[PDB]
């Protein structure tokens, strides 16, 4: 606004998991040529990477089948990357970097 943007009123991305959406889903839509369609909504995480989604189906009349991998890309324009070591020794000089 009237003041140049300082660093007091910005939220920070926090969620950095490695595997999510460990759910189970059921299909009961009325058939249409034997193909039932279900619509689901998902809220993406706060990482900049490529997520891979895999699904496995197991019915009672056909058996078991495995779907194909699906890829979703999350991307921004200007951002920050932080690289940290796994563990740090107490009471010793340490250097970290931000890109």
């Amino acid at each position: 606004d009237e003041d140049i943007i300082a660093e007091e009123n910005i939220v920070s991305r926090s969620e950095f998991p490695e595997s999510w959406l460990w759910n189970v889903e059921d299909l009961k839509e009325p058939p249409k040529n034997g193909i039932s369609t279900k619509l689901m909504n998902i809220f993406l995480k706060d990482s900049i990477t490529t997520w891979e989604i895999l699904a496995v189906s197991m019915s009672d009349k056909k058996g078991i089948c495995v779907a194909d991998p699906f890829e979703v890309t999350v991307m921004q324009d200007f951002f920050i990357d932080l690289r940290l070591p796994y563990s740090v020794v107490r009471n010793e000089q340490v250097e970290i970097r931000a890109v």
């Binding site: 991305r13 490695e18 595997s19 999510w20 959406l21 460990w22 759910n23 189970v24 889903e25 059921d26 299909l27 009961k28 839509e29 034997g34 193909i35 039932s36 369609t37 279900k38 619509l39 689901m40 909504n41 998902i42 809220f43 993406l44 995480k45 706060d46 990482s47 990477t49 490529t50 997520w51 891979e52 989604i53 895999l54 699904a55 496995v56 189906s57 197991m58 019915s59 009672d60 009349k61 056909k62 058996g63 078991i64 089948c65 495995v66 779907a67 194909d68 699906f70 890829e71 979703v72 890309t73 999350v74 991307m75 921004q76 990357d81 690289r83 070591p85 796994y86 970097r97 890109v99």
Partner: protein, 629 residues
């Protein structure tokens, strides 16, 4: 009244449904099952034979019990109104499968492990029984064991474990098995090792999978590195080579190179001189049978990351092809032509494509190969009963004569009585069969040349997944020598089937038979599709929401999991795929020989089938569990 015949599967599995084919060649018949001394009675069935139905009994029953705790047998008997025929068969314990899925591949101390177990039976349908699961540390002593039941869940079991904070490192194992039969186990592996997630991926690839020893350009490889979200990378790379022998690795210190990677593209070349000087073998021909591998490391221009990628197993060969005889019948056909099916592959095992084969002995007898790398050939017989040797050699053009693969194979005769000598083989182009298509089984036949006007019909059976899928009956009128069966290929035939046919002739007693092995395309019978139901405007943004669309068969359950793509860079082994499922189900069949045994007993007992006759013209028995070797 003349004869009565029973056709039965070789091995029957408990807690399932089995069949017998009864052929009287207006009579009530009954079948019964007794134990082996005599444990009361197991089951019995009653049926009638009708002349309008060609006297065929498709008798089905379910085999039960808890006393069945070495291997054991069971007796099946059948009385056809007045006469009794019986036979003793073996009973096994393997009664299903077990598949294990884990969300990730590599963990750190303090995290949690989440996995799932799927249970299926022989037909690949959901079942419910009792299972037990153990977790084994690298040494081998179990750490935690548990027992579970999967009733009223349609056959999916989720579980969980929590790694401690002060734990060992390395490889850990999960072993699961049914409670009834502890002889068979199923296993899965994962890793435990501290790490930090990388940021980009590196790919190393050569231009030719093999390595001809007579090239002056050595071996050339290319390096391609890319970020995870799709943009290109810059940096510097160090590459080194090696030599791999049977459990041995030798490093060549003279071959270490530094190259600048710009836009993700680097080139490395290795010459003959360095390879020759690295080893103490001036003779080049001594190097055949030893492999090569290359290792690379990529660093950025900001000094922030470090990634390593390795490709192993570049073979050293002089012939860029290979011949095989894995699926060719071994017993030839006296008089009638003999059909061969060759198999050509690349040195890495990938099937070849559009390469011609031939025979050195004859001329112009050649063909090509479809996408499976299989070529069909035919050859005439002497027909003297002396065994014959055949040779195969590749006849590809635009190549020197000194670089053609070849090999040899031997055949053995067939021991008939009275020289009936009748066979079966389909004269159709062996192509990519697909479900929903049609097949034309062509009975290429040669009866006795004297009085071939007495035979009225034949009998044929289809075998798949170790069970009798269908039994037919096709007739003919005297004076013919070719008949056709227009089979309709359905979805249940996946992944392969075996056709066996026979007929009976009045002598003394005559029975003649043969068998054929056919394969179909492999894919799951159902269909599951996942895609983006969103309008697909642009790339998403963190914290947004989107829509996911699924399509599948009605009344099923879909399980999901999402994993980052940076984990697969660290360790990308032991995943789940449909090819694995088909490999597992295919590897555990009964009849392992392609077919066409030495005689009628040979052909009937080489396809996991048992034939019993009222005149004592039976087949031998087996009491082991796997075919030799």
């Amino acid at each position: 009244s003349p004869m009565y015949s029973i056709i039965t599967p070789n091995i029957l599995r408990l807690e399932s449904e089995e069949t017998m084919v009864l052929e009287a060649h207006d009579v009530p018949v009954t079948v019964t099952v007794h134990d082996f001394g005599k444990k009361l009675v197991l089951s019995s069935e009653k049926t009638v034979l009708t002349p309008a139905t060609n006297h065929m009994g498709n008798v089905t029953f379910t085999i039960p019990n808890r006393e069945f705790k070495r291997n054991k047998f069971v007796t099946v008997q059948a009385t056809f109104g007045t006469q009794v025929v019986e036979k003793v068969v073996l009973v096994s314990l393997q009664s299903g499968y077990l598949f294990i899925q884990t969300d990730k591949t590599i963990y750190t101390p303090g995290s949690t492990v989440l996995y799932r177990i799927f249970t299926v039976n022989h037909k690949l349908l959901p079942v419910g029984r009792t299972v037990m699961v153990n977790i084994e540390n690298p040494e081998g002593i179990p750490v935690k064991q548990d027992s579970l039941s999967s009733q009223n869940q349609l056959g999916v079991l989720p579980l969980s474990w929590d790694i401690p904070e002060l734990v060992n490192m390395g490889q850990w194992k999960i072993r699961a098995y049914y409670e009834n039969s502890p002889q068979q186990v199923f296993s899965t592996e994962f890793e435990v090792k501290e790490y930090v997630l990388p940021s980009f991926e590196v790919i190393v690839e050569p231009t030719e999978k093999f390595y001809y020893i007579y090239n002056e350009k050595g071996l050339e490889v290319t390096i391609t590195a890319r970020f995870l979200y799709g943009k290109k990378v810059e940096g510097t790379a160090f590459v080194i080579f090696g030599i791999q022998d049977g459990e041995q690795r030798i490093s060549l210190p003279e071959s270490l190179k530094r190259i600048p990677i710009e836009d993700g593209s680097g080139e490395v070349v290795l010459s003959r001189k360095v390879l020759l000087d690295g080893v103490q073998n001036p003779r080049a021909e001594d190097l055949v049978g030893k492999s090569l591998y290359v290792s690379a490391t990529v660093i950025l221009h900001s000094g922030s990351d470090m990634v390593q990628a390795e490709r192993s197993g570049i073979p050293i060969v002089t012939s860029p092809y290979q011949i095989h005889f894995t699926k060719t019948p071994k017993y030839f056909k006296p008089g009638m032509p003999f059909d061969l099916m060759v198999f050509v592959t690349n040195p890495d095992g990938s099937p070849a494509y559009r390469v011609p084969v031939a025979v050195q002995g004859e001329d112009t007898v050649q063909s090509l190969t479809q996408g499976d790398g299989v070529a069909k050939l035919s050859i005439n017989t002497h027909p003297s009963q002396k065994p014959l040797s055949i040779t195969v050699r590749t006849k590809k053009q635009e190549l020197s004569e000194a670089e053609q693969a070849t090999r040899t194979m031997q055949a053995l005769p067939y021991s008939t009585v009275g020289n009936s000598n009748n066979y079966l083989h389909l004269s159709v182009l062996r192509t990519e069969l697909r479900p929903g298509e049609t097949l034309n089984v062509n009975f290429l036949l040669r009866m006795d040349r004297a009085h071939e006007a007495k035979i009225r019909y034949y009998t044929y059976l289809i075998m798949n997944k170790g069970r009798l899928l269908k039994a037919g009956r096709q007739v003919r009128e005297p004076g013919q020598d070719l008949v056709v069966l227009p089979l309709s290929i359905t979805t249940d035939f996946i992944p392969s089937f075996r056709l066996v046919a026979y007929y009976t002739l009045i002598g003394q007693r005559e029975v003649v038979a043969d068998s054929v092995w056919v394969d179909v395309k492999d894919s799951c019978v159902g269909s599951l599709v996942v895609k983006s139901g969103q309008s697909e405007d642009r790339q998403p943004v963190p914290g947004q929401q989107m829509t996911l669309k699924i399509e599948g068969d009605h009344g099923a359950r879909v399980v999901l999991v999402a994993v980052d793509k940076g984990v697969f860079v660290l360790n990308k082994k032991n995943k789940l795929t449909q090819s694995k499922i088909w490999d597992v189900v295919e590897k555990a069949d009964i009849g392992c020989t392609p077919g066409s045994g030495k005689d009628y007993a040979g052909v009937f007992s080489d396809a996991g089938l048992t034939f019993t006759s009222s005149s004592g013209q039976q087949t031998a028995q087996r009491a082991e569990l796997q075919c030799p070797q």
